[PDB]
Structures are given as C-alpha cells and as structure tokens.
Design a protein around this ligand. Structure first.
Ligand code: ATP
Ligand code: MN
Ligand code: MN
Ligand code: MN
Length: 336
C-alpha cells in the first residue's frame, strides 16, 4: 500500500497545442502537470491510480470535476485518463501545497497522513462470507508491484530471466497445508468451508486439497479464481476455476522457482490431481525499459480472442517478480 508517496520529478517535456500544461515523468509513470509546477528533480507527492482522494478544493481543486460517490464518503478516484490527447496516470503535486510534510523526503509513504484510501470495485457476493480467521502469517500474500515503480530494479536485473504468465482478472486464492490443517483463503482472510463459497467450492472440484495432503508438504497453492460472476468474466468461462501462478514453501519461507513450480504442477497432474496454471508464455531474458516491458502487456488472454489485463514476470530463482498491466486494457475497462 504505497498509494501516496513522495517521489522525484523526472524528464519534463512540452505538449503541443497547449503550453498551459506539460508532461512529467515520475519513475515509470507519465503524468500531465500544469506548466510552472515542477522542475526536473523537484519533489512532490505522487498519488497512484485507484487512489480515492476526498474532496478538497485548496489541496485537490483539479479533481473537482470527476468527484463521485464512494461508500458514503466522497472524493475523486484516480484512474487512467487521456487529457488533451495525452495518456496520464496518477497525480503529482509539489511540496508547497502540503505544508505539513516538509519533514519527509523521497520514498516516504504518506498515504495514511493524507487520508488516502483505495477504490475497489464491487466485490461479488460469493467470495466473502464465513471468515475463520486471518490470512496465515506464515504465508505471504499475493501482490505484484507494477513495473512502473521498479525503474532501478529493472536495470539492475539486466541479464536475469523470467517466467512470463498471463495476468487473469478474477480474485486471489490460496489453498495451503500446514501439518494436519489444510486451509482455504481469499486475499486477506482464511475462510470456512460452506455450501456455495466460490473459493472452497473451487478447491474441491480440482481435488487440490487431496493433492496437497498427497504431497505431504507444507505448501501454499496460490492462484487466481476466475469465471462466471467474477470481474465481468472477461474470458467468458462457464463456472469458476482456479488457475495457479505461485507456490509458497511454508517452511523455507520462500516461493518455489518456476522450474520448481512447473515440476510440482506436473507431479500433481501425473497423480490425477488436475490443477490449472495461468497461461505460460516464453521465458524472457530481461534487457528492456519499463516502456518496452509495458508494450508486451497487451495481447491474447486465456481466451485468445479477448485482450488480456497484462502479464506477470517471475525471476527464475523465485526471488523477484513484478506485473505489467496493459494500458489499453485500463482505458477499455474503466471500471477497473
Ligand atoms: N499469472 C499471475 N501471476 C501473479 N498474479 C496474478 C496472475 N494472474 C492474476 N494475478 C493476480 O494479480 C494480483 C496482483 O496484481 P495487482 O497488483 O493488480 O493486485 P491488486 O491491485 O492488489 O488486486 P487486483 O489485481 O484484483 O486489482 C494477485 O493478487 C493475483 O491474484
Ligand atoms: Mn497490487
Ligand atoms: Mn485483478
Ligand atoms: Mn489493481
């Protein structure tokens, strides 16, 4: 959760037809600023897309016209937009308009002090219910940093090679085993086994619980549940199915390498435990810019006639991973 952070203004270029504004690079993000607002190297607060920013006309008067209603409280939800022909993602405001935060500097997460929350679409009914407890603390949650935020890491990972997978749009799902206990979790909570719960019901049609206890290992099968009712069903599936993308070694406190995972996925299907994996593409030796990685995000999804949300890259040592979301996808499904 780094929705509002203090960053450094990168390269600033003009925009033809209107010099009231200019285009300012913030790490891998691009963002339209008023002319005379930033100089290259200055510091400001960058608000990522999906930020929900409560209405304030001294601090956020440029969000005035897109103020909406969200959970009774009320402000502007930042999302991908084309302003005067220029693709613009996020918000970049200088430190002068935040007098209470001169004390901070680059890297500081100022989300909480600015009251920033995250907009989230209506999460469908069959994915939250009887909660047994918290997401196990001995299991890592399933978040992928955007490539736009890893500009130095991308260049220092030159030479490294990655497993490239399709980013399916559903919800994150974790089925795991610790000793005698097999469990089923959503994003932030372990759930109880009930009658129509999508996660638990998904985990039994593929018998992945009996596959985990068969492997006799403390592992965490983490994948994406997509299908009917879930996020518009972009792939046009029938029903709901689980598509694995990561396997967490509970005891070693690390993820399996993609080779370790691909060996475990086959071991499962060789023994009649039929699990699906997120679509696999050719592995990639990193050598590209952020903009050239993002240029690979668009393309066919699981349904090869629909355009995918993006891609996710996992270093073949299982230690470093990131996402790359199609910007065409974000413009098309503006409810995301
Ligand atoms: N092949 C894949 N590899 C890794 N993660 C994937 C894959 N396909 C889908 N995902 C999902 O993408 C999520 C990480 O991407 P992202 O940072 O966009 O998550 P988020 O913004 O927290 O939630 P959401 O993706 O629902 O908006 C994971 O929680 C995972 O469930
Ligand atoms: Mn995320
Ligand atoms: Mn998603
Ligand atoms: Mn998201």
């Amino acid at each position: 959760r780094k929705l509002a952070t203090i960053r450094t203004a990168g390269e600033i270029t003009p925009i033809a037809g209107a010099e009231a504004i200019e285009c300012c690079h913030v790490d891998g993000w691009t963002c339209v600023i008023k002319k005379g607002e930033f100089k290259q190297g200055d510091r400001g607060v960058y608000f990522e897309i999906d930020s929900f920013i409560k209405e304030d006309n001294d601090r956020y008067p440029m969000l005035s016209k897109q103020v909406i209603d969200y959970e009774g409280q009320r402000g502007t939800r930042l999302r991908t937009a084309r302003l005067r022909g220029q693709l613009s993602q996020g918000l970049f405001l200088p430190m002068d308009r935040f007098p209470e935060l001169a004390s901070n500097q680059v890297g500081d997460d100022v989300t909480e002090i600015l009251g920033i929350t995250k907009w989230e679409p209506p999460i469908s009914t069959n994915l939250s219910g009887e909660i047994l407890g918290e997401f196990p603390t001995f299991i890592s949650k399933t978040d992928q940093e955007a490539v736009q935020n890893l500009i130095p890491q991308i260049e220092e990972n030159k030479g490294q090679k990655f497993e490239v997978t399709v980013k399916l749009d559903g919800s994150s799902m974790t089925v795991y085993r610790k000793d005698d206990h097999i469990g089923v979790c959503g994003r932030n909570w372990e759930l109880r086994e009930t009658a129509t719960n999508a996660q638990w019901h998904a985990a039994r049609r593929n018998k992945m619980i009996e596959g985990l206890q068969f492997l006799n290992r403390n592992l965490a099968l983490q994948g994406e549940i997509i299908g009917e009712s879930i996020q518009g069903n972009l792939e046009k599936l029938k029903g709901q199915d689980f598509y694995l993308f990561d396997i967490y070694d509970i005891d070693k406190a690390q993820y399996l390498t993609p080779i370790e995972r691909q060996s475990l996925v086959k071991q499962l299907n060789d023994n009649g435990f039929t699990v699906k994996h997120v679509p696999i593409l050719d592995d990639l030796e990193l050598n590209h810019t952020a903009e050239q990685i993002l240029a690979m995000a668009d393309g066919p999804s699981l349904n090869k006639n629909v355009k995918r949300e993006g891609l996710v890259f996992k270093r073949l040592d299982g230690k470093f991973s990131f996402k790359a979301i199609s910007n065409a996808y974000l413009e098309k499904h503006k409810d995301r």
